[PDB]
Amino acid sequence: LSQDFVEALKAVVGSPHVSTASAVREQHGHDESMHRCQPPDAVVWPQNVDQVSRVASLCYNQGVPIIPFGTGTGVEGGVCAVQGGVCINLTHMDQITELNTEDFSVVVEPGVTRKALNTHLRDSGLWFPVDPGADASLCGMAATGASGTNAVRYGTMRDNVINLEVVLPDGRLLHTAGRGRHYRKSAAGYNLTGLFVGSEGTLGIITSTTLRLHPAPEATVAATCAFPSVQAAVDSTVQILQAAVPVARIEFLDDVMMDACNRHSKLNCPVAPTLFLEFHGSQQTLAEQLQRTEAITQDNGGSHFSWAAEKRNELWAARHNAWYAALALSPGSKAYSTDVCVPISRLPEILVETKEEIKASKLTGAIVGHVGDGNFACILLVDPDDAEEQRRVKAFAENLGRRALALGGTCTGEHGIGLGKRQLLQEEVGPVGVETMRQLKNTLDPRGLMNPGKVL
Ligand SMILES: Cc1cc2nc3c(=O)[nH]c(=O)nc-3n(C[C@H](O)[C@H](O)[C@H](O)COP(=O)(O)OP(=O)(O)OC[C@H]3O[C@@H](n4cnc5c(N)ncnc54)[C@H](O)[C@@H]3O)c2cc1C
Ligand SMILES: CC(C)C[C@@H](O)C(=O)O
């Protein structure tokens, strides 16, 4: 970047809020993925939406790529500056506004995390349910189309984003459903909100998200259930869903994952393929749900439920930190991930096959997953210097993605495409799907400067 351009950035946001220092750029050049750190040419922290718009307009008109940056917890290289440019760290805009408890809605800026929102909401009787394990930017979660353990009951980001404020690549300000609007449903025009959820910073910069809030459950029960086999745990999951038990959380850990979590959390669960379960209801609807869920797990060899405020928090903290538990197995490893999602009836086939394929290869791997959605992740731990191992693990991940596609599923349930799944996406939606997505990309970002090299 020229020094005139850098001074122009400083004129917008203030000198302390622009950095061209290599260390600062390198910290913003990677996420949690394997994709090589590619440092942006500068990092900029806008302090308000007007500044976001002016930074975007300056970059766009000068041919400088723009990389939106939330909390940098993505796992597909979304923030990697493959073509250089300006990384826009959005987290100084950290205000919660327009809290409408009577309407179950709130507006959050990119610096607001789920933990901050739910802390702000304690005593309200409301909470925000979509819970990635990282305390991520809520606007980043809208950008990636995130889900979480609670999504099986309470929906994904797509289900819970009511409106978005978006700075388009050339700086124009768009309120996807209209400025200030919030409602339960609409047929008014084309739904623009859904287009920007899961856009990963390639269509514009989300500067606020209007979120659906949910009533806190009357009563909560959590438990773990150990199984003799992966087949037994996943058959139980499918049968629980087919019986329409409205479980709040249903999470799978294979024996490898469970052992890693034990070692990283001082849980001490039996080392076995395991379901972490949570139920929400009145003290008596719970008794009904438990009754019927235990009957199904018992049919498949599940243990009697090991019951879990403080022990349940411990349970879900261990689950949320599964990524770090797996990385801690061999210190220094980074890791590759998968994220397939299949029709639920095909979930037993693909999980059992994945476990078998992990055994049959040199590969080390742990399995954890939002199986209530038909979704799971492989965590594939690698040496950052062993190029041969990385080639095998990438080949494994691509084969797993293609197997999910063969079953009618999707290559990513929640993490997104970034740099890692672009070729799988082309196979998933085919030539007319690819061209259609590209046409939408081109009308919003004619110059191709909005997070280039990602998704498409
Ligand atoms: C331990 C751990 C557990 C996780 N668990 C889950 C899980 O259960 N479910 C799940 O879905 N993900 C999960 N993730 C992945 C990650 O937390 C989510 O993808 C999250 O939504 C990323 O948010 P972020 O702000 O950190 O993203 P970043 O890495 O900062 O950015 C991700 C992508 O979105 C873009 N972007 C970010 N902010 C904006 C914005 N305001 N406007 C436009 N584009 C933007 C970036 O350009 C990039 O392409 C987990 C990650 C970790 C490390
Ligand atoms: C970090 C991801 C590979 C796993 C994450 O999505 C989770 O469900 O804990």
mmCIF file of N, CA and C in Angstrom, residues 338-450:
data_model
loop_
_atom_site.group_PDB
_atom_site.id
_atom_site.type_symbol
_atom_site.label_atom_id
_atom_site.label_comp_id
_atom_site.label_asym_id
_atom_site.label_seq_id
_atom_site.Cartn_x
_atom_site.Cartn_y
_atom_site.Cartn_z
ATOM 1 N N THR A 338 -13.553 -31.332 9.059
ATOM 2 C CA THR A 338 -14.641 -31.565 8.123
ATOM 3 C C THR A 338 -15.936 -31.143 8.802
ATOM 4 N N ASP A 339 -17.031 -31.129 8.037
ATOM 5 C CA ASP A 339 -18.266 -30.544 8.542
ATOM 6 C C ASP A 339 -19.460 -31.020 7.723
ATOM 7 N N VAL A 340 -19.448 -32.267 7.252
ATOM 8 C CA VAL A 340 -20.529 -32.696 6.371
ATOM 9 C C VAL A 340 -21.859 -32.749 7.119
ATOM 10 N N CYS A 341 -22.939 -32.651 6.353
ATOM 11 C CA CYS A 341 -24.281 -32.789 6.893
ATOM 12 C C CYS A 341 -25.101 -33.580 5.887
ATOM 13 N N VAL A 342 -25.721 -34.665 6.344
ATOM 14 C CA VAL A 342 -26.397 -35.599 5.443
ATOM 15 C C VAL A 342 -27.833 -35.768 5.910
ATOM 16 N N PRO A 343 -28.721 -36.262 5.040
ATOM 17 C CA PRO A 343 -30.047 -36.683 5.512
ATOM 18 C C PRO A 343 -29.881 -37.629 6.693
ATOM 19 N N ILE A 344 -30.703 -37.441 7.733
ATOM 20 C CA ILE A 344 -30.434 -38.118 9.004
ATOM 21 C C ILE A 344 -30.415 -39.631 8.850
ATOM 22 N N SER A 345 -31.246 -40.182 7.966
ATOM 23 C CA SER A 345 -31.260 -41.637 7.827
ATOM 24 C C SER A 345 -29.936 -42.179 7.305
ATOM 25 N N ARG A 346 -29.134 -41.354 6.629
ATOM 26 C CA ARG A 346 -27.821 -41.766 6.141
ATOM 27 C C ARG A 346 -26.702 -41.476 7.129
ATOM 28 N N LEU A 347 -27.006 -40.829 8.253
ATOM 29 C CA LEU A 347 -25.960 -40.504 9.216
ATOM 30 C C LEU A 347 -25.266 -41.733 9.792
ATOM 31 N N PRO A 348 -25.965 -42.815 10.165
ATOM 32 C CA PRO A 348 -25.234 -43.999 10.656
ATOM 33 C C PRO A 348 -24.221 -44.536 9.660
ATOM 34 N N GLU A 349 -24.608 -44.680 8.388
ATOM 35 C CA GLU A 349 -23.670 -45.165 7.377
ATOM 36 C C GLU A 349 -22.406 -44.323 7.338
ATOM 37 N N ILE A 350 -22.558 -43.002 7.239
ATOM 38 C CA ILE A 350 -21.383 -42.172 7.012
ATOM 39 C C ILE A 350 -20.521 -42.032 8.271
ATOM 40 N N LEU A 351 -21.123 -41.929 9.464
ATOM 41 C CA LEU A 351 -20.297 -41.920 10.677
ATOM 42 C C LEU A 351 -19.547 -43.224 10.885
ATOM 43 N N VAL A 352 -20.232 -44.359 10.736
ATOM 44 C CA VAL A 352 -19.544 -45.634 10.913
ATOM 45 C C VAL A 352 -18.437 -45.785 9.878
ATOM 46 N N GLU A 353 -18.720 -45.415 8.628
ATOM 47 C CA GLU A 353 -17.706 -45.488 7.581
ATOM 48 C C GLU A 353 -16.536 -44.552 7.872
ATOM 49 N N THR A 354 -16.818 -43.368 8.424
ATOM 50 C CA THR A 354 -15.747 -42.427 8.743
ATOM 51 C C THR A 354 -14.835 -42.991 9.825
ATOM 52 N N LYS A 355 -15.431 -43.557 10.875
ATOM 53 C CA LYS A 355 -14.653 -44.208 11.923
ATOM 54 C C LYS A 355 -13.800 -45.332 11.347
ATOM 55 N N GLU A 356 -14.381 -46.146 10.463
ATOM 56 C CA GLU A 356 -13.630 -47.240 9.852
ATOM 57 C C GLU A 356 -12.489 -46.713 8.993
ATOM 58 N N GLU A 357 -12.733 -45.629 8.253
ATOM 59 C CA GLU A 357 -11.701 -45.082 7.380
ATOM 60 C C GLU A 357 -10.575 -44.453 8.182
ATOM 61 N N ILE A 358 -10.903 -43.861 9.328
ATOM 62 C CA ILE A 358 -9.872 -43.343 10.222
ATOM 63 C C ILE A 358 -8.979 -44.470 10.735
ATOM 64 N N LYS A 359 -9.578 -45.581 11.189
ATOM 65 C CA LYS A 359 -8.762 -46.722 11.618
ATOM 66 C C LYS A 359 -7.858 -47.213 10.486
ATOM 67 N N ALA A 360 -8.401 -47.321 9.282
ATOM 68 C CA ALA A 360 -7.671 -47.966 8.189
ATOM 69 C C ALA A 360 -6.511 -47.137 7.644
ATOM 70 N N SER A 361 -6.361 -45.881 8.055
ATOM 71 C CA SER A 361 -5.311 -45.009 7.542
ATOM 72 C C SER A 361 -4.318 -44.669 8.648
ATOM 73 N N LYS A 362 -3.170 -44.100 8.253
ATOM 74 C CA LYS A 362 -2.257 -43.569 9.263
ATOM 75 C C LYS A 362 -2.867 -42.432 10.065
ATOM 76 N N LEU A 363 -4.054 -41.962 9.698
ATOM 77 C CA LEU A 363 -4.540 -40.693 10.214
ATOM 78 C C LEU A 363 -4.977 -40.805 11.666
ATOM 79 N N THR A 364 -4.643 -39.775 12.431
ATOM 80 C CA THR A 364 -5.191 -39.554 13.755
ATOM 81 C C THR A 364 -6.403 -38.649 13.595
ATOM 82 N N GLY A 365 -7.473 -38.951 14.323
ATOM 83 C CA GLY A 365 -8.678 -38.153 14.204
ATOM 84 C C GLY A 365 -9.608 -38.350 15.375
ATOM 85 N N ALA A 366 -10.334 -37.286 15.711
ATOM 86 C CA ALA A 366 -11.418 -37.324 16.678
ATOM 87 C C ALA A 366 -12.698 -36.901 15.973
ATOM 88 N N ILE A 367 -13.825 -37.429 16.436
ATOM 89 C CA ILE A 367 -15.127 -37.141 15.844
ATOM 90 C C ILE A 367 -16.025 -36.518 16.899
ATOM 91 N N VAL A 368 -16.632 -35.386 16.557
ATOM 92 C CA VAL A 368 -17.567 -34.696 17.431
ATOM 93 C C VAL A 368 -18.640 -34.101 16.535
ATOM 94 N N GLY A 369 -19.863 -34.004 17.039
ATOM 95 C CA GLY A 369 -20.847 -33.504 16.102
ATOM 96 C C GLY A 369 -22.231 -33.147 16.578
ATOM 97 N N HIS A 370 -22.809 -32.150 15.900
ATOM 98 C CA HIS A 370 -24.214 -31.766 16.025
ATOM 99 C C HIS A 370 -25.071 -32.785 15.271
ATOM 100 N N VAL A 371 -25.081 -34.012 15.799
ATOM 101 C CA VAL A 371 -25.724 -35.127 15.108
ATOM 102 C C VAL A 371 -27.236 -34.991 15.050
ATOM 103 N N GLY A 372 -27.837 -34.190 15.933
ATOM 104 C CA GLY A 372 -29.257 -33.910 15.822
ATOM 105 C C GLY A 372 -29.626 -33.232 14.522
ATOM 106 N N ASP A 373 -28.657 -32.589 13.873
ATOM 107 C CA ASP A 373 -28.848 -31.963 12.572
ATOM 108 C C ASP A 373 -28.380 -32.845 11.423
ATOM 109 N N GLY A 374 -27.913 -34.063 11.701
ATOM 110 C CA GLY A 374 -27.267 -34.861 10.676
ATOM 111 C C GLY A 374 -25.866 -34.406 10.334
ATOM 112 N N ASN A 375 -25.199 -33.717 11.254
ATOM 113 C CA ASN A 375 -23.959 -33.000 11.008
ATOM 114 C C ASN A 375 -22.902 -33.530 11.972
ATOM 115 N N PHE A 376 -21.657 -33.587 11.510
ATOM 116 C CA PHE A 376 -20.559 -33.921 12.409
ATOM 117 C C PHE A 376 -19.263 -33.375 11.836
ATOM 118 N N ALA A 377 -18.260 -33.283 12.706
ATOM 119 C CA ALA A 377 -16.932 -32.819 12.344
ATOM 120 C C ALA A 377 -15.896 -33.883 12.665
ATOM 121 N N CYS A 378 -14.963 -34.063 11.742
ATOM 122 C CA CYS A 378 -13.725 -34.777 12.001
ATOM 123 C C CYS A 378 -12.673 -33.735 12.329
ATOM 124 N N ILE A 379 -11.921 -33.962 13.394
ATOM 125 C CA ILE A 379 -10.786 -33.117 13.733
ATOM 126 C C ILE A 379 -9.541 -33.941 13.451
ATOM 127 N N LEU A 380 -8.758 -33.513 12.461
ATOM 128 C CA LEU A 380 -7.660 -34.297 11.902
ATOM 129 C C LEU A 380 -6.351 -33.568 12.162
ATOM 130 N N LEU A 381 -5.576 -34.101 13.086
ATOM 131 C CA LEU A 381 -4.536 -33.359 13.761
ATOM 132 C C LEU A 381 -3.283 -33.581 12.928
ATOM 133 N N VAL A 382 -2.566 -32.509 12.574
ATOM 134 C CA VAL A 382 -1.434 -32.641 11.659
ATOM 135 C C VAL A 382 -0.207 -31.864 12.121
ATOM 136 N N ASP A 383 0.947 -32.314 11.628
ATOM 137 C CA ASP A 383 2.208 -31.609 11.809
ATOM 138 C C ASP A 383 2.309 -30.523 10.744
ATOM 139 N N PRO A 384 2.432 -29.247 11.124
ATOM 140 C CA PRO A 384 2.485 -28.175 10.114
ATOM 141 C C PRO A 384 3.676 -28.258 9.167
ATOM 142 N N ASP A 385 4.672 -29.099 9.448
ATOM 143 C CA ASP A 385 5.834 -29.238 8.578
ATOM 144 C C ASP A 385 5.815 -30.508 7.739
ATOM 145 N N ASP A 386 4.912 -31.446 8.025
ATOM 146 C CA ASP A 386 4.871 -32.732 7.330
ATOM 147 C C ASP A 386 3.928 -32.587 6.141
ATOM 148 N N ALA A 387 4.499 -32.248 4.982
ATOM 149 C CA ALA A 387 3.689 -32.012 3.791
ATOM 150 C C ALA A 387 3.014 -33.285 3.296
ATOM 151 N N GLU A 388 3.652 -34.442 3.482
ATOM 152 C CA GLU A 388 3.043 -35.697 3.052
ATOM 153 C C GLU A 388 1.809 -36.019 3.885
ATOM 154 N N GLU A 389 1.914 -35.870 5.209
ATOM 155 C CA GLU A 389 0.766 -36.099 6.080
ATOM 156 C C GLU A 389 -0.381 -35.156 5.743
ATOM 157 N N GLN A 390 -0.073 -33.877 5.512
ATOM 158 C CA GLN A 390 -1.119 -32.925 5.156
ATOM 159 C C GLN A 390 -1.798 -33.304 3.850
ATOM 160 N N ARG A 391 -1.049 -33.880 2.911
ATOM 161 C CA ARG A 391 -1.642 -34.280 1.643
ATOM 162 C C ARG A 391 -2.612 -35.438 1.840
ATOM 163 N N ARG A 392 -2.271 -36.372 2.729
ATOM 164 C CA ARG A 392 -3.166 -37.487 3.017
ATOM 165 C C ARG A 392 -4.410 -37.017 3.754
ATOM 166 N N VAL A 393 -4.245 -36.108 4.712
ATOM 167 C CA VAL A 393 -5.385 -35.673 5.507
ATOM 168 C C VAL A 393 -6.340 -34.842 4.661
ATOM 169 N N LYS A 394 -5.800 -33.990 3.786
ATOM 170 C CA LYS A 394 -6.647 -33.256 2.850
ATOM 171 C C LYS A 394 -7.376 -34.209 1.909
ATOM 172 N N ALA A 395 -6.684 -35.247 1.429
ATOM 173 C CA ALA A 395 -7.340 -36.241 0.586
ATOM 174 C C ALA A 395 -8.463 -36.945 1.338
ATOM 175 N N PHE A 396 -8.237 -37.259 2.615
ATOM 176 C CA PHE A 396 -9.285 -37.853 3.440
ATOM 177 C C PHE A 396 -10.481 -36.916 3.557
ATOM 178 N N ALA A 397 -10.221 -35.644 3.862
ATOM 179 C CA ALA A 397 -11.308 -34.687 4.041
ATOM 180 C C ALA A 397 -12.117 -34.519 2.760
ATOM 181 N N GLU A 398 -11.440 -34.457 1.612
ATOM 182 C CA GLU A 398 -12.150 -34.326 0.344
ATOM 183 C C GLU A 398 -12.973 -35.571 0.037
ATOM 184 N N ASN A 399 -12.435 -36.762 0.327
ATOM 185 C CA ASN A 399 -13.200 -37.985 0.095
ATOM 186 C C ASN A 399 -14.428 -38.051 0.992
ATOM 187 N N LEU A 400 -14.291 -37.631 2.252
ATOM 188 C CA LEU A 400 -15.452 -37.595 3.136
ATOM 189 C C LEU A 400 -16.502 -36.622 2.615
ATOM 190 N N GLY A 401 -16.075 -35.432 2.188
ATOM 191 C CA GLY A 401 -17.018 -34.492 1.602
ATOM 192 C C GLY A 401 -17.740 -35.069 0.401
ATOM 193 N N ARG A 402 -17.001 -35.749 -0.482
ATOM 194 C CA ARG A 402 -17.623 -36.339 -1.662
ATOM 195 C C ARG A 402 -18.573 -37.473 -1.298
ATOM 196 N N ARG A 403 -18.260 -38.240 -0.249
ATOM 197 C CA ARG A 403 -19.194 -39.256 0.228
ATOM 198 C C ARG A 403 -20.493 -38.632 0.721
ATOM 199 N N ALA A 404 -20.398 -37.533 1.473
ATOM 200 C CA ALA A 404 -21.610 -36.845 1.905
ATOM 201 C C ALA A 404 -22.415 -36.343 0.712
ATOM 202 N N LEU A 405 -21.736 -35.815 -0.310
ATOM 203 C CA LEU A 405 -22.450 -35.374 -1.504
ATOM 204 C C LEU A 405 -23.148 -36.540 -2.193
ATOM 205 N N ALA A 406 -22.509 -37.715 -2.214
ATOM 206 C CA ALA A 406 -23.132 -38.873 -2.844
ATOM 207 C C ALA A 406 -24.397 -39.305 -2.120
ATOM 208 N N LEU A 407 -24.515 -38.984 -0.833
ATOM 209 C CA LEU A 407 -25.671 -39.334 -0.024
ATOM 210 C C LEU A 407 -26.760 -38.268 -0.056
ATOM 211 N N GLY A 408 -26.625 -37.252 -0.908
ATOM 212 C CA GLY A 408 -27.604 -36.188 -0.992
ATOM 213 C C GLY A 408 -27.423 -35.071 0.007
ATOM 214 N N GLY A 409 -26.290 -35.022 0.697
ATOM 215 C CA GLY A 409 -26.039 -34.025 1.710
ATOM 216 C C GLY A 409 -25.237 -32.842 1.208
ATOM 217 N N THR A 410 -24.615 -32.150 2.157
ATOM 218 C CA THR A 410 -23.873 -30.930 1.896
ATOM 219 C C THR A 410 -22.470 -31.060 2.474
ATOM 220 N N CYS A 411 -21.520 -30.364 1.850
ATOM 221 C CA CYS A 411 -20.133 -30.429 2.301
ATOM 222 C C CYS A 411 -19.874 -29.625 3.569
ATOM 223 N N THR A 412 -20.796 -28.753 3.969
ATOM 224 C CA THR A 412 -20.634 -27.986 5.201
ATOM 225 C C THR A 412 -21.983 -27.675 5.823
ATOM 226 N N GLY A 413 -22.166 -28.134 7.062
ATOM 227 C CA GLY A 413 -23.371 -27.814 7.795
ATOM 228 C C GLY A 413 -23.362 -26.436 8.414
ATOM 229 N N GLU A 414 -22.179 -25.902 8.739
ATOM 230 C CA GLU A 414 -22.116 -24.660 9.506
ATOM 231 C C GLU A 414 -20.839 -23.836 9.308
ATOM 232 N N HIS A 415 -19.690 -24.480 9.066
ATOM 233 C CA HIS A 415 -18.417 -23.752 9.069
ATOM 234 C C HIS A 415 -18.255 -22.848 7.858
ATOM 235 N N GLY A 416 -18.805 -23.238 6.724
ATOM 236 C CA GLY A 416 -18.648 -22.471 5.507
ATOM 237 C C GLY A 416 -17.608 -23.067 4.583
ATOM 238 N N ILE A 417 -17.302 -22.302 3.540
ATOM 239 C CA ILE A 417 -16.474 -22.764 2.427
ATOM 240 C C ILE A 417 -15.061 -22.208 2.509
ATOM 241 N N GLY A 418 -14.940 -20.899 2.740
ATOM 242 C CA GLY A 418 -13.637 -20.248 2.786
ATOM 243 C C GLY A 418 -12.760 -20.621 1.612
ATOM 244 N N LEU A 419 -11.531 -21.031 1.933
ATOM 245 C CA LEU A 419 -10.569 -21.532 0.963
ATOM 246 C C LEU A 419 -10.588 -23.049 0.843
ATOM 247 N N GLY A 420 -11.199 -23.749 1.790
ATOM 248 C CA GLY A 420 -11.049 -25.189 1.879
ATOM 249 C C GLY A 420 -12.011 -26.030 1.063
ATOM 250 N N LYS A 421 -13.252 -25.575 0.887
ATOM 251 C CA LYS A 421 -14.291 -26.405 0.290
ATOM 252 C C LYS A 421 -14.787 -25.867 -1.048
ATOM 253 N N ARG A 422 -13.985 -25.047 -1.737
ATOM 254 C CA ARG A 422 -14.476 -24.418 -2.958
ATOM 255 C C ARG A 422 -14.766 -25.444 -4.039
ATOM 256 N N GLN A 423 -13.961 -26.497 -4.114
ATOM 257 C CA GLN A 423 -14.139 -27.449 -5.193
ATOM 258 C C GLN A 423 -15.331 -28.353 -4.868
ATOM 259 N N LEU A 424 -15.500 -28.700 -3.586
ATOM 260 C CA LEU A 424 -16.685 -29.439 -3.159
ATOM 261 C C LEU A 424 -17.964 -28.654 -3.430
ATOM 262 N N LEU A 425 -17.937 -27.334 -3.226
ATOM 263 C CA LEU A 425 -19.129 -26.536 -3.501
ATOM 264 C C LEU A 425 -19.518 -26.620 -4.973
ATOM 265 N N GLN A 426 -18.530 -26.560 -5.872
ATOM 266 C CA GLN A 426 -18.830 -26.675 -7.295
ATOM 267 C C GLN A 426 -19.507 -28.003 -7.609
ATOM 268 N N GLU A 427 -19.038 -29.091 -6.992
ATOM 269 C CA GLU A 427 -19.675 -30.387 -7.201
ATOM 270 C C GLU A 427 -21.070 -30.419 -6.586
ATOM 271 N N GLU A 428 -21.242 -29.753 -5.445
ATOM 272 C CA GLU A 428 -22.506 -29.799 -4.715
ATOM 273 C C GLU A 428 -23.648 -29.136 -5.475
ATOM 274 N N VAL A 429 -23.417 -27.972 -6.079
ATOM 275 C CA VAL A 429 -24.507 -27.235 -6.716
ATOM 276 C C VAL A 429 -24.455 -27.246 -8.233
ATOM 277 N N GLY A 430 -23.374 -27.723 -8.833
ATOM 278 C CA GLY A 430 -23.321 -27.877 -10.269
ATOM 279 C C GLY A 430 -23.155 -26.568 -11.014
ATOM 280 N N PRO A 431 -23.068 -26.653 -12.343
ATOM 281 C CA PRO A 431 -22.712 -25.459 -13.132
ATOM 282 C C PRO A 431 -23.721 -24.328 -13.055
ATOM 283 N N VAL A 432 -25.020 -24.628 -13.042
ATOM 284 C CA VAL A 432 -25.997 -23.545 -12.993
ATOM 285 C C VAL A 432 -26.035 -22.925 -11.601
ATOM 286 N N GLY A 433 -25.874 -23.746 -10.562
ATOM 287 C CA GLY A 433 -25.748 -23.199 -9.220
ATOM 288 C C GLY A 433 -24.525 -22.313 -9.062
ATOM 289 N N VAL A 434 -23.383 -22.749 -9.599
ATOM 290 C CA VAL A 434 -22.168 -21.945 -9.485
ATOM 291 C C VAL A 434 -22.326 -20.629 -10.230
ATOM 292 N N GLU A 435 -22.813 -20.684 -11.474
ATOM 293 C CA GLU A 435 -22.968 -19.444 -12.226
ATOM 294 C C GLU A 435 -23.944 -18.502 -11.538
ATOM 295 N N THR A 436 -25.039 -19.040 -10.992
ATOM 296 C CA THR A 436 -26.006 -18.188 -10.306
ATOM 297 C C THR A 436 -25.383 -17.520 -9.085
ATOM 298 N N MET A 437 -24.646 -18.279 -8.267
ATOM 299 C CA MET A 437 -24.001 -17.638 -7.124
ATOM 300 C C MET A 437 -22.985 -16.603 -7.580
ATOM 301 N N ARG A 438 -22.259 -16.901 -8.658
ATOM 302 C CA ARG A 438 -21.289 -15.952 -9.180
ATOM 303 C C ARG A 438 -21.954 -14.684 -9.693
ATOM 304 N N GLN A 439 -23.128 -14.815 -10.308
ATOM 305 C CA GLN A 439 -23.824 -13.626 -10.784
ATOM 306 C C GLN A 439 -24.239 -12.739 -9.619
ATOM 307 N N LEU A 440 -24.657 -13.342 -8.507
ATOM 308 C CA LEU A 440 -25.000 -12.541 -7.337
ATOM 309 C C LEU A 440 -23.757 -11.872 -6.756
ATOM 310 N N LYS A 441 -22.655 -12.619 -6.651
ATOM 311 C CA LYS A 441 -21.376 -12.044 -6.240
ATOM 312 C C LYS A 441 -20.987 -10.859 -7.115
ATOM 313 N N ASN A 442 -21.148 -10.997 -8.433
ATOM 314 C CA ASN A 442 -20.690 -9.954 -9.346
ATOM 315 C C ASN A 442 -21.534 -8.686 -9.249
ATOM 316 N N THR A 443 -22.842 -8.804 -9.013
ATOM 317 C CA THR A 443 -23.618 -7.565 -8.964
ATOM 318 C C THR A 443 -23.335 -6.771 -7.705
ATOM 319 N N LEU A 444 -23.053 -7.453 -6.597
ATOM 320 C CA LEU A 444 -22.751 -6.755 -5.354
ATOM 321 C C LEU A 444 -21.289 -6.332 -5.276
ATOM 322 N N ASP A 445 -20.388 -7.084 -5.906
ATOM 323 C CA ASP A 445 -18.950 -6.807 -5.866
ATOM 324 C C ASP A 445 -18.395 -6.859 -7.285
ATOM 325 N N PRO A 446 -18.750 -5.885 -8.130
ATOM 326 C CA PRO A 446 -18.282 -5.934 -9.527
ATOM 327 C C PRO A 446 -16.782 -6.095 -9.673
ATOM 328 N N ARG A 447 -15.993 -5.397 -8.860
ATOM 329 C CA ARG A 447 -14.544 -5.424 -9.001
ATOM 330 C C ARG A 447 -13.889 -6.640 -8.353
ATOM 331 N N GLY A 448 -14.654 -7.485 -7.664
ATOM 332 C CA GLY A 448 -14.087 -8.666 -7.041
ATOM 333 C C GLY A 448 -13.141 -8.375 -5.897
ATOM 334 N N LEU A 449 -13.364 -7.280 -5.173
ATOM 335 C CA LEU A 449 -12.476 -6.855 -4.097
ATOM 336 C C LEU A 449 -12.983 -7.226 -2.712
ATOM 337 N N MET A 450 -14.177 -7.800 -2.613
ATOM 338 C CA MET A 450 -14.783 -8.156 -1.330
ATOM 339 C C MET A 450 -14.350 -9.564 -0.942
#
